[model samples]
Target: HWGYGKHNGPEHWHKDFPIAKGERQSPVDIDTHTAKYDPSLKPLSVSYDQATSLRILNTGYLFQVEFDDSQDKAVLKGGPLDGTYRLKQFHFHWGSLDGQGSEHTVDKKKYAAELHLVHWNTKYGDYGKAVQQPDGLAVLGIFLKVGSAKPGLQKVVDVLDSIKTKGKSADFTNFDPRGLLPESLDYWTYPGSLTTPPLTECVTWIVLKEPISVSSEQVLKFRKLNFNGEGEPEELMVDNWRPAQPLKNRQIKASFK
Candidate 1:
């Protein structure tokens, strides 16, 4: 199985998913100076209903809070997107320790962690079909730095103990994802692929410039989760992020000058 292990980590991913090295590969290093300022870009609109959140689960690779996407209760609109994109799930990527987790970097500077709020374009009808189209998905990336504890994130951290093992889950209801947003909505937008396996070139990457804060103590709690199941040998789920890929010929657009 592909994982962040010496044997099956990112370096070996292209062997299975050839597109992993494709031109539009994601998590590219953001050179702020080179990014074009597009005044034409509109403000991002994210309206999420608390009731749309269903539960949280440990996928062995990462933990994700899933939403009920049956309707347009939660969505992402405007900002490089043509139609509404329904919220599918949201997850995080963090380092084993601190200060080295984010996949995308600003001038090669990495944050302690990164949060991905994934949504799929509704024009395709469903996520299964959406994943194959170029404009089918939109993933909002938020950087997390170690500092004062984020109250919005505490709810997520509090449930970590219950899902410390792979496949474990707990009821995570009535949660508002907007509470986790940083003060600013300014972002860098680009055409990129999913950072993980399958590495589909179907995502419009919207990475926020402002990073949210998380205490050093809370990040340690995430390291306690296991990559293995309850009976299997324990392997800490750390460094669960792919390094930045080549930018190729893609141009990154900035929403703010």
Candidate 2:
């Protein structure tokens, strides 16, 4: 069965995933009407190997991988902003259908999918504690578009079959998350909440304006992942993203010249 509005669906997700209800839930729609355009913002550098920790989970999200950073050079570099923040985790938001996906929306348009890289200020200590502080969190949002096949992402797509069955995991060793970053780092920045529960209002969001391309087939395979246990009939997990919310007097600044 499809997973919308079900007890396990996003609407009721706060109960199962208490963190989803946080004050700073993300995937907010970017309405340029009230957004303040800034030309000084810059893309923060990221070192995937040093900044990411990996974990495979059987959560209802299916074939989910979490990324964290116990150590990161980019975080220490202090770009645009002063101070270093350690990486916490990375997760994805996608559409149930092929035509639409992603969490953050621009001008009411949804892409194929969105990836979030969560991080926390080291000044406040560990990630768990830092997330509660208003100035303690940072998130990088990357948009994915459906189009020509991207050879760069093949390594990730190639491993899908091995983990296709739910509630299963294998070492995603020697993989660099940086490979997924788009060539253009131009982005929109703002203060927002986490898209998931416990939606804390502590995140400084950096959403890349440029989207990366992937094959339609790649998106198709991603949609096929199931949240159920292995051997259980796989349920299609398309449209797993939340619609964008209003800017609500928030300001969105850009890094483009």
* Strongest candidate by TM-score: 1
lDDT per model, in order?
A: 0.93, 0.69
lDDT of 1 by residue, 1-257 (tens): 89998999999999999999899999999999999999999999988753378899999998999999998888999999998999999999999868698999999999899999999999999999999999999999999999999988889999999998899999998888988999999999999999999999999999999999999978888888899998999899899999999999999999997
TM values, all candidates: 0.98, 0.83
> 53-162, model 2: which lDDT tens digit per residue?
36654455644556555555335223344477776666666776656888888878888888887778888878888878887787888888988876766766777666
Question: TM-score of predicted model 2?
Answer: 0.83
Model 1: weakest 10-residue lDDT segment is 45-54
Stretches of model 2 off by over 4 angstroms after superposition: 1-8, 13-24, 40-43, 49-53, 62-64, 73-81, 231-233
